[PDB]
Symmetry: D2
Subunit: 245 residues, 4 copies
Amino acid sequence: SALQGKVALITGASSGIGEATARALAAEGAAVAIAARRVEKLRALGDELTAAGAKVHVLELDVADRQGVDAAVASTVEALGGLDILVNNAGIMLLGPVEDADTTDWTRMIDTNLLGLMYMTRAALPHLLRSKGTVVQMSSIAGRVNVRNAAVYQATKFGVNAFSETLRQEVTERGVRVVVIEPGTTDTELRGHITHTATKEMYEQRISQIRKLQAQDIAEAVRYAVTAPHHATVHEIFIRPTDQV
Amino acid sequence: PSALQGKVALITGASSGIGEATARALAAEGAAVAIAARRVEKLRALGDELTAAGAKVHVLELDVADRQGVDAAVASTVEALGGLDILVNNAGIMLLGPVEDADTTDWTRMIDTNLLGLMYMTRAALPHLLRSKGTVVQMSSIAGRVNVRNAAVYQATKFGVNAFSETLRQEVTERGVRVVVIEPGTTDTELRGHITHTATKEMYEQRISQIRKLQAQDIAEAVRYAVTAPHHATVHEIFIRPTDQV
Amino acid sequence: SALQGKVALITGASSGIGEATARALAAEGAAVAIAARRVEKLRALGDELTAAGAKVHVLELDVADRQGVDAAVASTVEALGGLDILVNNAGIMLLGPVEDADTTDWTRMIDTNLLGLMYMTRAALPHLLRSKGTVVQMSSIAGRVNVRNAAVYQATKFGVNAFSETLRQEVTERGVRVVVIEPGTTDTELRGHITHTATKEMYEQRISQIRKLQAQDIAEAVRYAVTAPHHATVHEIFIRPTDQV
Amino acid sequence: SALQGKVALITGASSGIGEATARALAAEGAAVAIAARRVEKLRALGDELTAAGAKVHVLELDVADRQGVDAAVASTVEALGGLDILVNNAGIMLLGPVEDADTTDWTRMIDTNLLGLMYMTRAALPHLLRSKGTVVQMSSIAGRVNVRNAAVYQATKFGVNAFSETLRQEVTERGVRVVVIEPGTTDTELRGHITHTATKEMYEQRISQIRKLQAQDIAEAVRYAVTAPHHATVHEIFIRPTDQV
Ligand SMILES: NC(=O)C1=CN([C@@H]2O[C@H](COP(=O)(O)OP(=O)(O)OC[C@H]3O[C@@H](n4cnc5c(N)ncnc54)[C@H](OP(=O)(O)O)[C@@H]3O)[C@@H](O)[C@H]2O)C=CC1
Ligand SMILES: NC(=O)C1=CN([C@@H]2O[C@H](COP(=O)(O)OP(=O)(O)OC[C@H]3O[C@@H](n4cnc5c(N)ncnc54)[C@H](OP(=O)(O)O)[C@@H]3O)[C@@H](O)[C@H]2O)C=CC1
Ligand SMILES: NC(=O)C1=CN([C@@H]2O[C@H](COP(=O)(O)OP(=O)(O)OC[C@H]3O[C@@H](n4cnc5c(N)ncnc54)[C@H](OP(=O)(O)O)[C@@H]3O)[C@@H](O)[C@H]2O)C=CC1
Ligand SMILES: NC(=O)C1=CN([C@@H]2O[C@H](COP(=O)(O)OP(=O)(O)OC[C@H]3O[C@@H](n4cnc5c(N)ncnc54)[C@H](OP(=O)(O)O)[C@@H]3O)[C@@H](O)[C@H]2O)C=CC1
């Protein structure tokens, strides 16, 4: 129980990497505030974790809503007494060419992956400053490598990375650790949201013949980074499927 | 001599700084120029100046953050000038300050202009550039390559422009659309005037006062070099820094 | 005992990060082949590890010596059964300006940090292919970020990173995992070897206010990467002192 | 006549990019010192350049040879008055897998692409400081992008880039401009030297369909960078074939 007495807030906790991360942190003894739009999914996860002995705080939240973000951080601190770890995991991946793109793909991705992550970082920061806490940014291979049909997705993830390095420069001397996780292909619900049909199909075929990373693997990376001693900031973990060039 | 005789260039953020100098430089090469920004009075004055020297000019009152405005500005340009050969996505704002307790309207403004605006204008011009085997020039920054304190969101937008633009290159380069990314360091423009975080504005102005700054004309020459390169050559990145600045 | 039955070869095991990594891998049940130029220190470590229950194979080796490298890989396979993990940790950091540099600084760094690492990678590769093994490259923050007075050091580490990314592209499909660890300032013998006296003094001063990373912290990064499931390649871990902008 | 009265030293001037660069700089009014191993090609170029109105100094030089490098710099200042522009263009590209690689490929590449470039940079530096001159580093797409079967070539070019960024930090304030040119596929003699036959055939097929960059295009990039006003350092120009993803 490396995180006994600590409080973690995890966005995008209703499925995928966020769900596995909530579980992994709870297993380490952290109280978990789990946030997402699908209230029912969170309550189900919340019940499971509570039944296993965890302290859970359920938050219905859209990370793109600045005021909503402020209230979620406030609610977490009221219910759980503080904030030691923030996991900015809420995100969406809408693939397709730039040409003739559905620009709501773009505004959604920017709102959630970039602005939402920034809003939640800023709202949590005074609390993380007090606790000399850790912010974990869920980036991507797409924050490191550019491939076709992911231009705006990659823009947001390279943006998260730059935002996060700069944030590290700003707050690291005050003991706030900035951790950036960069998974490659992970078996989640992420790809089901792709709106460009031809691209959804190409992407599905591209990832069909690898062993994908598991959400649990990414959760383990988070666990490794957050349980490191305070004097160490694991600023980047870049984890790739072994099967994938 | 006129390396760009007969070509049509659309330059966003043309009312001052790098965009103004770029519009002038391209006009001097014989390009017809569509000049876009929000301060129409500035644009008209530039248009008049350019027209007086024998240039063909189309004035566009435009906010790049306005998706509908963008489509209309591209349509207006192709109708007035015949087509589109070069797009220069130069409109942008740099609002420095710490992340902690930031005025988040700094952020939404930078994302709307620097990132979404540039993407909207890229997307709108692209069918025309495909037809002309044209060139899109993205005005990034040293901030797209190097992270310094108090520029978190600005740097996010510029690293974003770079990733968007490399991906775009992969998608369109085989069809003959060249993607050029220009990355200036400190350049003597109006940019710094807009910083809203007072302490940071003063820190920034103090830092840059100690160096010979890049000139807007220097960045215009970089654009000129990239766009006049033979079609088979894509000058994908030009990173130009003040010599005086580590 | 995650590595029971596995064989690891660690270069630069006589002190610093290599010593701590050898210790950490042995503690997980790995047989360890320990390689360096100071046999007296290697023997003293080997004595301890065998005392704790590890099988140890001592290698007197200069990584710059191509034939020495081939021979060290061969005697390890004969002695320990095979090769599962390679840790290319041997390195030197000779800081100074480029202007009037002692160019023997440069040849030493290139021979050890770059060429030596490449030689050992090539020599181990057949055995790593057969075992679906892992190669861990000890890079640096100097492979990610450039600072003054470290030009050739940074050249070698950026070089290590490129070489290793390319290597991953070449061998990952056959199950050879390529891991790159990038430590910031770590409290080891490394800084003692700087031959430019004025730069040594400046560097010591630059790092004097922070809590440095410890060799054991970097060993833990290695342990985490190598104990990850086979389908996961932790290609990069960038670990920085929290105190250091 | 933008470079009238200036002195340029170009390494690898006997063919390819270096030959075109010498021609371009001479055309702008520079006195040119042209360095390579094939003296008979150099003398033939020197005659053309002299016939065109340029002052030429011919240097037989192996850039891997430190002594020879120091003598070439001295010879040039004696013959031509000083040194204003250095073009470190000498290079070789030896492609092939890392696995079972002919390691002489590696040592040749490091000696020439990395060490020789560093040697020449260091030797020229005193003179460039006095003249507030420009050093131009001939890197590659291989210093920005990693592809298969180019591991060690990429290591050298990423190394050049790190070295050169650091060099810039060390010398920029004293008026020495550091310019890095990064060409993609260019139609030169480079690919003829590949020793791994299978890779040579794959590479030549790979580039068989595109309009390649021309040596003259790269010379123009150099011309643009060095004729920029002194307050501007064109630190990187990354120039790719339009036809090539
Ligand atoms: N799977 C993969 O291959 C990779 C994923 N990633 C990153 O992992 C992160 C999580 O995605 P992943 O688990 O894969 O996919 P999932 O779709 O399974 O998870 C995304 C989570 O984010 C939540 N979410 C989406 N939008 C919002 C919003 N606006 N406000 C609050 N919550 C939101 C979703 O829940 P809800 O709808 O209930 O709000 C869901 O819980 C993303 O940042 C993604 O970019 C990175 C690299 C690889
Ligand atoms: N100056 C510097 O040190 C550097 C600048 N840059 C980049 O150069 C580009 C131009 O800035 P620069 O010349 O320096 O500074 P300026 O402020 O002088 O120019 C910015 C231009 O963009 C226009 N603009 C701003 N927002 C919008 C918008 N919403 N819609 C349409 N036009 C807009 C402005 O005119 P108007 O108000 O009339 O609309 C102005 O013409 C920016 O992208 C900036 O990031 C990059 C690196 C360094
Ligand atoms: N300490 C730090 O702040 C950082 C270190 N690193 C990297 O970690 C690695 C280890 O350095 P560190 O532990 O810090 O310092 P140490 O000096 O304590 O360790 C270096 C090890 O390498 C060995 N070595 C040196 N040259 C050779 C050679 N030619 N052949 C075989 N072994 C050799 C030394 O042993 P022996 O003399 O017996 O051969 C020693 O065991 C290096 O690659 C370094 O670049 C990376 C980032 C930060
Ligand atoms: N062609 C391409 O697709 C690209 C090339 N490059 C770079 O451009 C540079 C020039 O190569 P390129 O023109 O293409 O090919 P070439 O082979 O035509 O030119 C290489 C030049 O380097 C010289 N040279 C090689 N070794 C040495 C040495 N040991 N000492 C002194 N001179 C030497 C050769 O002359 P000699 O034999 O007479 O000594 C020759 O003149 C290289 O650094 C290469 O990495 C970068 C990107 C793309």
